[model samples]
Target: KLHKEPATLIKAIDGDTVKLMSSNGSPMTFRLLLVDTPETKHPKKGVEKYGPEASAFTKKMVENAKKIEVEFDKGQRTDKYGRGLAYIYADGKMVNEALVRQGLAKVAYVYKPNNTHEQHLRKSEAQAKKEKLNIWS
Candidate 1:
């Protein structure tokens, strides 16, 4: 909620995950909160539909943004995989909400105290679904 940490994007792994370097110079595996995209790097599933488009959109946005930062939730900051979980902001926009608004992702992982942006994201998801943006199509 407060104290959004500054981070540098190293690489976009997929739609919902990214490789970033924290200001402290630690390599952080950043995972977007409240969203899940079609899997491009899923070991068991191979590649899902529209995975490439989703992956590309995320990569291009994160990579090309002039500035990027991260905001942790009110409760937890780390997940089971030791990945950092937060809402990612690129420039002035939020990549976490942007992906769902574009219909490239779905709101998932309903965890409490960390659901700061859940309401905003769900509205975007509904609009995208109603418009049949991408996943809805």
Candidate 2:
């Protein structure tokens, strides 16, 4: 069971840090797999470019979704911080890859086993580079 549960979007804390109604219905913190966008939860930064651009994109992507679902890769479901490490599929399009494809988030946390989706993400990152979108520029 790769934890592909039907989820509710509680909040988009940042591009990757998300709050969702998880399997038990409580709002669970989920760290999106395979990428890192700008940080909304920074130590001394607010109203900055990196933190909000991808943040807005992520919000817009899921804000009107009729169906949102959770997905898990092979291993390391949590970082010991207790956040559910998973992926977000909004309307069947993966927001993880979408963010990368849009040249927003960069491929990160590439450890083995959790590396299942890395190649696709890297390719998309390259595509974004060629297209010169945001970070790729």
Candidate 3:
């Protein structure tokens, strides 16, 4: 479920969300699939543990990407918030898995129809937990 046009990363809204612009100049907001970092900015929830670190990590990765690709799941495309749910590829690497592998995020928000990268994400999380890295520490 690759998007036909590549997206230009505007910025990482947080660890799991990004702002992008499509080829046709349409604004796009993507909620990274299968990874949920701590909340840095929630009106009600405020900031959570490791939230700032996760946000910084994501920002750095997005800033350094040579290319960015937004890929959707097999079925559902957007969440209830209207943000596009996607797997963000930065410089050909899966950013979603990277976050989990680094222990900056947890494998979460899974649903039946959008289970495309479930196994891979869970594997990364397991390894991160075993190694006790970052958040896992």
Question: Pick by TM-score: which candidate is best?
Answer: 1
Error of 2 at 40 (Å): 2.4
Q: Model 1, 29-137: lDDT tens per residue?
A: 9999999989987697889887898899999999899999999888888899999999999997999899899999999997998998899999999999999999999
Residue 52 lDDT in candidate 3? 91
Candidate ranking under lDDT, highest first, comes to 1, 3, 2
| Cα TM-score per model | 0.95, 0.91, 0.93
lDDT of each: 0.91, 0.85, 0.87
The better-scoring model by TM-score among 1 and 2 is: 1
Q: Higher lDDT: candidate 1 or 2?
A: 1
CA RMSD of each candidate after superposition: 1.0, 1.8, 1.5
Off by more than 4 A, model 3: 1-5
Query: After superposition, which runs of candidate 2 have C-alpha atoms over 4 Å from their true positions?
Result: 44-48
Clashes of 1: 0
Provide the lowest-lDDT 10-residue window in model 2. Answer: 42-51
Q: Model 3's lDDT to the true fold?
A: 0.87
Please state the error at residue 92 of candidate 1 in Å: 1.3
In angstroms, the error of model 2 at 78 is 1.4
lDDT of 2 by residue, 84-134 (tens): 887789999999999999888999988778877788889999999999999
Clashes of each: 0, 0, 0
